[PDB]
Amino acid sequence: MASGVTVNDEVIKVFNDMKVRKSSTPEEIKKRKKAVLFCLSDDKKQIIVEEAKQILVGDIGDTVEDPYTAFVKLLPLNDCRYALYDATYETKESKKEDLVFIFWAPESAPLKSKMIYASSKDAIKKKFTGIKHEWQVNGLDDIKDRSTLGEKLGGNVVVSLEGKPL
């Protein structure tokens, strides 16, 4: 009984979009994908993005109170999923931005959920050619720590992340 999962083309559009996301006018920035969570398609054979669980740069402040809390709301404690986000931080030398591949895997999720994604983990990562970061968070307590993020991207050089001092 062989099995395996792949990464849906949607994951690419997000990678190509999140890898080439440029800031020109706030009007376009509203469409600029800053954060997005990936889930299994209706076929449960590949990794596709869920429109219901994504965070744009314009959504924060229009219909969303916070980009983090928005993600914290989508994150299922009884289900594992992936999420790509762009971490904007500023160090004591200069301000820079980057993107990281996050893996949401709670301890309440079923082994079949962790295994299904585990099979696509490479496929989804393969599509993330150039991703120099990888975040493994099981629960919200693993990522709720603003420092836990600001450190993984920059570490002890980040004076502040997302507008919050580190």
Curated annotation (Swiss-Prot):
It comes from the Eukaryota. Controls reversibly actin polymerization and depolymerization in a pH-sensitive manner. It has the ability to bind G- and F-actin in a 1:1 ratio of cofilin to actin. It is the major component of intranuclear and cytoplasmic actin rods. The phosphorylation of Ser-24 may prevent recognition of the nuclear localization signal. A motif (Nuclear localization signal) lies at residues 30-34. Pfam families: Cofilin_ADF (PF00241). This is Cofilin-2. Widely distributed in various tissues. Belongs to the actin-binding proteins ADF family. Residues 4-153 form the ADF-H domain. SMART domains: ADF. Keywords: Actin-binding, Cytoplasm, Cytoskeleton, Nucleus, Phosphoprotein. CDD domains: ADF_cofilin_like. It comes from Gallus gallus (Chicken). It is found in: Nucleus matrix; Cytoplasm, Cytoskeleton.
